[PDB]
Amino acid sequence: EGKLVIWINGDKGYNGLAEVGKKFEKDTGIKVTVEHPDKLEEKFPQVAATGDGPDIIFWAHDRFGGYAQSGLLAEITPDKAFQDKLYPFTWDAVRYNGKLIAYPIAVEALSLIYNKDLLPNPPKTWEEIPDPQDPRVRGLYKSALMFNLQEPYFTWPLIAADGGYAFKYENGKYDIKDVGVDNAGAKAGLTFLVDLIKNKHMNADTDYSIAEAAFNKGETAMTINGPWAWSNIDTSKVNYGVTVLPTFKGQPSKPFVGVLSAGINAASPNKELAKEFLENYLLTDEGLEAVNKDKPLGAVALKSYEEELAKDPRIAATMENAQKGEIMPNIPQMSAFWYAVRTAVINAASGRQTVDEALKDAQTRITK
Numbered sequence: 001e002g003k004l005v006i007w008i009n010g011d012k013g014y015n016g017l018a019e020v021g022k023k024f025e026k027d028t029g030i031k032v033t034v035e036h037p038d039k040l041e042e043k044f045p046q047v048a049a050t051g052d053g054p055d056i057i058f059w060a061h062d063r064f065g066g067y068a069q070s071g072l073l074a075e076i077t078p079d080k081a082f083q084d085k086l087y088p089f090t091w092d093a094v095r096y097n098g099k100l101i102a103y104p105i106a107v108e109a110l111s112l113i114y115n116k117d118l119l120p121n122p123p124k125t126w127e128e129i130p131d132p133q134d135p136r137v138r139g140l141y142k143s144a145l146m147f148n149l150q151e152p153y154f155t156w157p158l159i160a161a162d163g164g165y166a167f168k169y170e171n172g173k174y175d176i177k178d179v180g181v182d183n184a185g186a187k188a189g190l191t192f193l194v195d196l197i198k199n200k201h202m203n204a205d206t207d208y209s210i211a212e213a214a215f216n217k218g219e220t221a222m223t224i225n226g227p228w229a230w231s232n233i234d235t236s237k238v239n240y241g242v243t244v245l246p247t248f249k250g251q252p253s254k255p256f257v258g259v260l261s262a263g264i265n266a267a268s269p270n271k272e273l274a275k276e277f278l279e280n281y282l283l284t285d286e287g288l289e290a291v292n293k294d295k296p297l298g299a300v301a302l303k304s305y306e307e308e309l310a311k312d313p314r315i316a317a318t319m320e321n322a323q324k325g326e327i328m329p330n331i332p333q334m335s336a337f338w339y340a341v342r343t344a345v346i347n348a349a350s351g352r353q354t355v356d357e358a359l360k361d362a363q364t365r366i367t368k
């Protein structure tokens, strides 16, 4: 009691938060502890399931419906005046069973970050990446594209591009049995990713870390990452641009828009202290700008603050791609989807399964 323990993934600005935390204490004389586990997404459900853990917790809203259905998260109640400070859509994202289960922090979406000093003009097509059709670049391709291949969230826009989909959205409801993970669209997208690899263009063991170091050092021209990545690049002295993602089979790459939400542990007896921290401190200009400077938020859910930095060009592009992708469901079976697809991508890329056997397997694990 009298001490907030907040969790926030490692790629987010945990140091920005902690600082805001100090601002709390310098006023309320309360200790806020910004920890940031590894796999906090999966630990949380397990630690709070036993009345233990973090007071407050951060994660892209797709994981909240689950926490909710199990009841590890307190129903939040800000007044309608506060609610209006935030764009409507973001509140919709933290809505489960007609009950707000989190505070919206910011909207994020992947983009194509390219090295302006190697590629003054980044491709407009995935199909150009392996075969560029321009002798000016051939002498350049260094690796052309490197991004994390371990998390399915990175491969999704490609798979989605020509028609893949998680759970079918039927105006207000998602038919949780109409899974579009194994179908031409998904097959076509994954097959391409496999060629990129089997055609020496990409390496199956690329994870966030490798791709980041690589693009940052300058040993690859292009990468795909969220707003959080921009920070290290700025302190890597790399000349980069953030643009719309390449189109696959003519259609655009549809990212999966995620809303960084900060919930409250039901098992926590510090709820009135969370509300004030999140409401009067973080969810403000000065507060969000604090977290933000550590590592960029994307389009912050706070209106006033979203507009000021709305003029930032990468925020503009982050919104362009977000605009083409679909915002992700917060239903409980999302977690089943990610685990099922991660595995699917891995075996596909790794060579352990055919594109079809791999995808039909994931599908089935989801519909089972």
Ligand SMILES: OC[C@H]1O[C@H](O[C@H]2[C@H](O)[C@@H](O)[C@H](O)O[C@@H]2CO)[C@H](O)[C@@H](O)[C@@H]1O
Pocket: 009, 011, 041, 059, 060, 061, 062, 063, 108, 151, 152, 153, 154, 226, 258, 338
């Ligand atoms: O890849 C599946 C996971 O993707 C999303 O997670 C993203 C997360 O939203 C993003 O902000 C983060 O920074 O990268 C991860 C994946 O590396 C979903 O939020 C996760 O819960 C999924 O499991």
